[PDB]
Amino acid sequence: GGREGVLKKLRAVENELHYNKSLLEEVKDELQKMRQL
Amino acid sequence: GGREGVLKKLRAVENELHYNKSLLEEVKDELQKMRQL
Numbered sequence A, B: 001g002g003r004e005g006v007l008k009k010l011r012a013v014e015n016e017l018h019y020n021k022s023l024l025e026e027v028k029d030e031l032q033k034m035r036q037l
Helices: A005-031 B005-031
Strands: none
Touching: A005 B005
């Protein structure tokens, strides 16, 4: 039960997931785009 | 060391992953749409 290198690792994980999230939204926006042009 | 801010962080992580999951299915559905049939 020390301190937490674990929290630090989870924070990186959650930041990396938010980065994949903005990219996925970018893919989605680009798709709902070329469903026109 | 007895409680868990860790659990809380993991719960936000897992929720964020389920959000990317629905968007990824929305991408795939949109793709299998603008396809052959």
